[PDB]
Amino acid sequence: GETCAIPAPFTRRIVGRDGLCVDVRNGYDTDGTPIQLWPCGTQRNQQWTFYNDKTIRSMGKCMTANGLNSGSYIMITDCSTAAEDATKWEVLIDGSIINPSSGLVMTAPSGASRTTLLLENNIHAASQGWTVSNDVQPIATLIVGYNEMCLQANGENNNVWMEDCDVTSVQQQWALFDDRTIRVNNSRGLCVTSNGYVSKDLIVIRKCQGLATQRWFFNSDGSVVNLKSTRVMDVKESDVSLQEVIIFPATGNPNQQWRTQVP
Amino acid sequence: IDYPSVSFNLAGAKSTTYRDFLKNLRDRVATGTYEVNGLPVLRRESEVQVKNRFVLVRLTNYNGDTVTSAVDVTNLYLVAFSANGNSYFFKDATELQKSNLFLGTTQHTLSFTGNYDNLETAAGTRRESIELGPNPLDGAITSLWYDGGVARSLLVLIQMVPEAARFRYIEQEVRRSLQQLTSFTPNALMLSMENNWSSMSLEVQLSGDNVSPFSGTVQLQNYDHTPRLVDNFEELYKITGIAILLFRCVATKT
Numbered sequence: 001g002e003t004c005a006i007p008a009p010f011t012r013r014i015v016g017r018d019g020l021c022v023d024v025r026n027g028y029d030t031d032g033t034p035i036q037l038w039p040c041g042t043q044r045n046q047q048w049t050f051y052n053d054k055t056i057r058s059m060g061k062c063m064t065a066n067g068l069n070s071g072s073y074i075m076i077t078d079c080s081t082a083a084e085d086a087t088k089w090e091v092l093i094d095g096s097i098i099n100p101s102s103g104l105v106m107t108a109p110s111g112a113s114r115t116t117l118l119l120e121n122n123i124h125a126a127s128q129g130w131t132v133s134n135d136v137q138p139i140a141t142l143i144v145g146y147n148e149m150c151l152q153a154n155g156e157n158n159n160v161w162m163e164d165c166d167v168t169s170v171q172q173q174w175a176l177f178d179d180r181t182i183r184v185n186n187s188r189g190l191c192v193t194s195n196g197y198v199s200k201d202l203i204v205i206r207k208c209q210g211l212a213t214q215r216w217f218f219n220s221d222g223s224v225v226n227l228k229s230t231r232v233m234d235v236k237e238s239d240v241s242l243q244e245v246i247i248f249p250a251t252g253n254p255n256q257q258w259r260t261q262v263p
Numbered sequence: 264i265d266y267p268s269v270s271f272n273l274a275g276a277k278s279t280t281y282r283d284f285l286k287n288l289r290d291r292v293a294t295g296t297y298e299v300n301g302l303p304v305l306r307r308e309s310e311v312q313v314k315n316r317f318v319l320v321r322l323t324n325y326n327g328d329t330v331t332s333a334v335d336v337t338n339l340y341l342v343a344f345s346a347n348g349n350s351y352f353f354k355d356a357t358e359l360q361k362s363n364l365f366l367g368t369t370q371h372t373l374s375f376t377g378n379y380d381n382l383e384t385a386a387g388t389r390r391e392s393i394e395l396g397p398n399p400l401d402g403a404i405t406s407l408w409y410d411g412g413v414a415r416s417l418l419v420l421i422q423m424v425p426e427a428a429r430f431r432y433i434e435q436e437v438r439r440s441l442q443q444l445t446s447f448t449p450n451a452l453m454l455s456m457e458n459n460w461s462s463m464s465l466e467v468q469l470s471g472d473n474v475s476p477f478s479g480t481v482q483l484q485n486y487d488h489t490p491r492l493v494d495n496f497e498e499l500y501k502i503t504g505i506a507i508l509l510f511r512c513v514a515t516k517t
């Protein structure tokens with residue numbers, strides 16, 4: 001065969017809450033400077049390099065977990081002096097920046113600017129969503145489910161059902177945030193929040209709050225499930241007329257398959 | 264060699280029939296012990312039996328006529344097709360296929376080979392011009408069974424069958440046409456996403472399973488021809504919707 005060429009150090013950005021990228025406070029490269037949220041842009045204190053050692057360092061200082069227990073904030077520091085088991089990371093496809101050792105993941109307590117990051121317990125919430133890329137701009141696309149219809153949103157705190165795909169309509173336009181939350185392209189302040197964790201629970205459209213019911217991982221199999229439970233977003237009884245999209249265990253049936261068809 | 268086959272009858276076929284037809288042609292080559300974030304990595308020639316190397320596809324147009332094409336189980340490429348006891352193979356056509364491809368039919372050899380760069384040339388037209396959909400598929404099918412088989416026609420089936428299973432995006436695209444009985448032409452995106460199958464194939468196996476970030480990038484394109492460099496798995500699938508991966512390398516973080 002042929003093993004894969006050891007990837008070289010590549011630099012990218014990291015977003016994961018309201019569209020904010022993880023930035024180095026003030027931009028100081030000094031050791032100790034905490035890490036938090038800040039509007040994405042052209043700056044060295046926002047670009048991070050990934051190395052084989054699983055160490056993400058910006059400015060040249062490895063990102064290390066100041067502490068080691070639920071609550072310890074994050075910050076940079078000399079890679080040579082900082083603890084090894086505190087400088088390694090893991091960017092899973094679930095958008096969760098986990099730390100092999102501590103087993104904790106990067107968490108954003110609030111989408112408010114300046115919100116200082118801090119490693120917290122991994123409970124699979126929209127607060128632990130993180131997508132690394134040079135494009136902080138979310139994806140705009142529709143979602144075709146059953147009967148070739150598109151999942152359209154209506155008003156706040158109202159169920160979501162499939163309506164005849166209308167590209168021109170904005171009631172069917174969605175924005176796939178990097179924090180792993182699906183918010184209506186129009187008012188990007190409303191995320192597709194579920195209503196529970198038990199199979200057969202409705203799925204409406206309410207404000208975003210890093211809720212665990214607002215975590216969506218686009219399974220490569222075509223299904224759109226939430227991280228917490230294995231429940232999948234589908235159409236009740238495969239009948240779109242019911243106008244009720246809910247969460248149900250992966251059955252592998254058509255009414256559980258989706259597709260983000262670009263703009 | 265009784266090679267298997269996946270058939271799709273244009274005869275009043277629905278969109279849900281297209282989704283299944285692709286799922287069959289997919290699983291017929293998805294059989295293997297190598298995955299990555301879900302998407303499988305088609306086997307290679309180094310480990311593919313001569314009795315499992317190929318897979319046939321029977322596409323029947325409105326007039327009942329049916330044309331069968333062989334799709335390599337390794338790269339999902341179109342090696343040859345047959346209509347009315349008449350098989351056709353490309354210029355190169357590795358002698359390995361002919362030896363057991365449509366054995367028992369009048370063999371033929373085209374002056375060109377299988378690949379857009381060539382196909383588009385042997386037709387005086389580019390894919391950005393050739394239309395796809397229900398009717399275009401029918402006419403393309405007829406042009407083969409009747410006129411022997413020329414580039415153009417093939418350019419329609421390739422993006423309407425193999426390339427349709429590789430990228431789910433192209434699927435929902437032909438799924439809207441099949442149902443709405445409408446037609447369309449590949450856009451800057453659809454085209455670019457199908458021009459980097461190999462590239463985006465190594466970026467998935469390189470990063471490894473579960474790893475979202477990509478060491479390199481994929482120069483995709485938007486409808487306005489604007490550059491859209493994808494550097495992560497999620498962002499890639501959400502757009503292209505890849506479902507098949509061409510073996511470009513084996514994992515290392517074992």
Ligand SMILES: *[C@@H]1O[C@H](CO)[C@@H](O[C@@H]2O[C@H](CO)[C@@H](O)[C@H](O)[C@H]2NC(C)=O)[C@H](O)[C@H]1NC(C)=O
Nearest residue numbers: 140141170173174175184185186187188262263
């Ligand atoms: C999705 O919604 C956004 C706004 O929420 C649309 O953005 C447009 O372009 C920029 C970027 O936001 C801004 O000028 C405005 O917000 C929007 N209007 C115009 C005229 O640009 C974006 O176009 C929407 N996506 C799609 C596919 O319609």
Ligand SMILES: OC[C@H]1O[C@@H](O)[C@H](O)[C@@H](O)[C@H]1O
Nearest residue numbers: 023024025026027037038045
């Ligand atoms: O997040 C805190 C911010 O502080 C500012 O002073 C600086 O210009 C930004 O780059 C960022 O570091």
Ligand SMILES: OC[C@H]1O[C@@H](O)[C@H](O)[C@@H](O)[C@H]1O
Nearest residue numbers: 234235236237238251253256
């Ligand atoms: O009919 C009961 C359920 O059956 C499942 O197969 C389907 O995925 C669910 O969405 C629901 O329809």
